[PDB]
Structure 1
Amino acid sequence: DDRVLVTETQVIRETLWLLSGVKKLFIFQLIDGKVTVRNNIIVTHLTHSCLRSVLEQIAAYGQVVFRLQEFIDEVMGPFRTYQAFMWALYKYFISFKEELAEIEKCIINTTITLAIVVDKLAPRLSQLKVLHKVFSTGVAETRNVVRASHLLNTLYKAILEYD
């Protein structure tokens, strides 16, 4: 069986793009709206399987950010609530993107490897998991008055859980 034998730093750059929400990446090639790791990726170390393990976790995070980017796309291309809801979501992404973009600076210009960028991103991969559950109730649903009431009421309920 053949493998591509990618280098090490190239993975972190690819991981940052997955965090950014961009598509068509040499790694994490989605098929049906579900990001999935390739099969020929291998490093000099990590025995070709742990890599499939560590990437599989970050992939689970790509799903959370790819689906949201698909949601924001289906609003840009007069509900006045979803359109007002994405602007809050969209605002959060710009600031989140800046932290990921900044890290890329310290890559081209100090040693950096996998186990460091993950732990550096702990207070973000935590905040992101919440959105996968808050938004899950804003996507599972037909009238325009029940889709906006049930959404706005889910937040005020989900906040009292975190008090």
Structure 2
Amino acid sequence: PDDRSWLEHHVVHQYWTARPSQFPHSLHLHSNLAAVWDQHLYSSDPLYVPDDRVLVTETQVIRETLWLLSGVKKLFIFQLIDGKVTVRNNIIVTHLTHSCLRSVLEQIAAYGQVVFRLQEFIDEVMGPFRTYQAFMWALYKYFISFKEELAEIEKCIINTTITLAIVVDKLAPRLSQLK
């Protein structure tokens, strides 16, 4: 209302600021799959056990994962365990019933740890050796070019049909080099 209305419209605010997501849908199994399976589970008598996850949309995940992958840390998604990002099991998308998601988000979390530790290492040289200083400089010189390509993709998100398998495949020559 009047400022929260404008906020709710143009900015999102729905899992990471408390506002239960009423995102419209076309239901009918291909995008209703989590609900279809939950209703099936209840009809087979679990018994009861309501599963509570807070329902993020699809594209928001992909954008957040981009910002995770580029090299900046501390996002809302992905529970950290020591400084190791893992899959968040407190969110859910309208289909896939949180299992395929649990696999693929684990893959990107595996990449997120490798980039997290390297960027933390580079940060801890600025707070000599004459060889560590050149080493972090080479690592950094890679990272800036890598981060640039991620950032232009994230810019081009706002400017179409976005799903996982395009941005995953497009970043194959980057996650290969990351290993």
Residue 39, structure 1, aligned to residue 89, structure 2? yes
Rounded Cα–Cα distance in structure 2 between residues aligned with 1:76 and 1:29: 27
Tell me by how many angstroms 1:29 deviates: 2.4
Q: Mark the structure with the bigger radius of gyration.
A: 2
Q: 2:119 aligns with which of 52, 69, 84?
A: 69
SS in 2 for 1:25: coil
Tell me by how many angstroms 1:33 deviates: 2.2
CA root-mean-square deviation: 1.0
Q: Which has the higher helix share?
A: 1
Q: Report the equivalent of 2:73.
A: 23
Q: Report the equivalent of 2:143.
A: 93
The one-letter amino acid of 1:102's match is E
SS in 1 for 2:83: coil
The one-letter amino acid of 1:55's match is L
1:58-102 deviations in whole A, cap 9, x for unaligned? 000001100101110110121110011100000100000010000
Q: How many residues are paired up?
A: 129
Tell me by how many angstroms 1:21 deviates: 2.1
Q: Report the equivalent of 2:10.
A: none
Q: 2:160 aligns with which of 110, 114, 117?
A: 110
| TM-score, with length taken from structure 2 | 0.70
Rounded Cα–Cα distance in structure 1 between residues aligned with 2:81 and 2:53: 20
Rounded Cα–Cα distance in structure 1 between residues aligned with 2:90 and 2:63: 18
Sequence identity (%) = 100
SS in 2 for 1:36: coil
Question: What stretches of structure 2 of length at least 5 have no aligned partner?
Answer: 1-50
The one-letter amino acid of 1:114's match is L
Tell me by how many angstroms 1:22 deviates: 2.0
Rounded Cα–Cα distance in structure 2 between residues aligned with 1:21 and 1:37: 17
Large movers: runs of 4+ above 6 Å: none
| TM-score, with length taken from structure 1 | 0.76
The one-letter amino acid of 2:135's match is F
Q: Report the equivalent of 2:62.
A: 12
